[PDB]
Amino acid sequence: AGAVIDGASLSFDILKTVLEALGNVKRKIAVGVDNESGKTWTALNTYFRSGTSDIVLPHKVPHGKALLYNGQKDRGPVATGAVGVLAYLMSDGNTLAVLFSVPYDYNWYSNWWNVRIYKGKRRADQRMYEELYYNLSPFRGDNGWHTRNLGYGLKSRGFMNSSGHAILEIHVSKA
Amino acid sequence: AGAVIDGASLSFDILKTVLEALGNVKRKIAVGVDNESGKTWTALNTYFRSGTSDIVLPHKVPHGKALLYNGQKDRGPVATGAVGVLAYLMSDGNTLAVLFSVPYDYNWYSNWWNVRIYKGKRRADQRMYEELYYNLSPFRGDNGWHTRNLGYGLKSRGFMNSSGHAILEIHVSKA
């Protein structure tokens, strides 16, 4: 069970300790999503293209709170990373989705992330991963902040670093 | 399983986030113990005089790492405080014991804590709690740091606040 902390407490430092707490795995990610949307989010599901998470998505994330989640590559001598999608059903029946991609091979790939509000209840799956990763303009994990109007009177402001031990911090707020 | 982070990452803010993650309970405590003793610690056990914890002590806390732990009122409708002792067996065969006491009723009680190294492997129990509280001069949760040489070439510096939403952070280092 991932933690649900005060929105204002989410920071790079909290995410870096989550990363430290995961241990010396080659590819891992600490994810923080601050809910300032004015609507309560209810965990829907996650989908991992590569890797796993030892924890589950926090069930409820009220406005003013942030969820902490993490993921990592499958354990053992396997050249893979941590890539997946987490989805939350918003109070209005729409789905907030977050993509994270921490590849094993940095010679040909880079870190990417994305966030999007889908209409209606949309579970995370292979299609959503492909949609978010290839066709819906993901942001690079480039050690820089990125802001995007999500429609529905909200916007996201997020940051993801460039390394294999990644942190992804996103704030969803009212436009 | 409580988190094991880099010792230099342990801070009041990290502990404050651990507290928030426990949700709205009247009595709860976030404990952080940074091992800079020069010796590896192996979890021994915990003893709760009041309250409980929904996690266990991280098994191994090597030099340079800090353990994160927590406690709270009893599982159930019965409102209590969070009072107990956690014990770690150091590399030399001696036991690092830590007392934390967050009472239910502040009219007659206050926050207290204590740190002490026992000779040999000594499991936390009712007796160790009695000793650390009634016999061995515990420190008050008075928003102040307190230093005490522990013997074995080590000292402890700790801080605890005074509220029912308690934070106790201790650094064990070379004297």
Amino acid making up residue A46: T
Angle at B141 between CA B137 and CA B144, to 5 degrees: 100
Query: Who's near A34: CB < 8 A, 6+ residues apart?
Result: A7, A10, A65, A66, A169, A170, A171, A172, A173
H, E, C per residue of B56-95? CCCCEECCCEEEEEEEECCCCCCCCCEEEEEEEEECCCCE
A37 is in an annotated binding site: no
Whether A17 sits inside 8 A of B4 (CB atoms) is no
> Going from the N-terminus, what domains does chain B have, and what CATH number goes with each?
1-175 (2.60.270.20)
**What is the phi/psi pair of residue A98, to 5°?**
-130, 125
Structure-token match 């949760």, residue found: B141
Q: How far apart are CA B158 and CA A120, in angstroms?
A: 51
A contacts of B20 (beta carbons < 8 Å): 3-6, 9
Name the residue among B152, B149, B171 with its Cα closest to residue B160. Answer: B171
Cα–chain center distance at B131: 15
Q: How far apart are CA B129 and CA A165, in angstroms?
A: 40
Q: What is the Cβ-side half-sphere exposure of residue B4, based on CA atoms within 13 angstroms?
A: 19
Q: How far apart are CA A158 and CA B5, in angstroms?
A: 24
Identify how the structure was determined.
X-ray
Q: Which residues pair with B140 in a beta bridge?
A: B112
Query: What Å resolution does this PDB entry report?
Result: 1.9
Query: Who's near B119: CB < 8 A, 6+ residues apart?
Result: B94, B95
Q: How far apart are CA A9 and CA B3, in angstroms?
A: 18
Q: How far apart are CA B129 and CA B100, in angstroms?
A: 9
Please say whether the beta carbons of B34 and B170 come within 8 A: yes
Q: How far apart are CA B113 and CA B11, in angstroms?
A: 17
- A126 contacts chain B (CB < 8 A): no
Q: How far apart are CA A52 and CA A41, in angstroms?
A: 22
Q: Which residues pair with B172 in a beta bridge?
A: B35, B156
Whether A20 sits inside 8 A of B14 (CB atoms) is no
B contacts of A30 (beta carbons < 8 Å): none
Q: How far apart are CA B30 and CA B48, in angstroms?
A: 15
Task: Tell me which DSSP letter residue B25 carries.
Answer: -
* Tokens matching residue B131: 């000793």
Angle at B22 between CA B103 and CA B164, to 5 degrees: 25
Distances (CA, A) of A157 to A34, A139, B1, B17, B50: 10, 11, 32, 21, 43
Report the 10 Å Cβ neighbour count for A103.
21
* Tokens matching residue B2: 């409580």
Whether B14 sits inside 8 A of A9 (CB atoms) is no
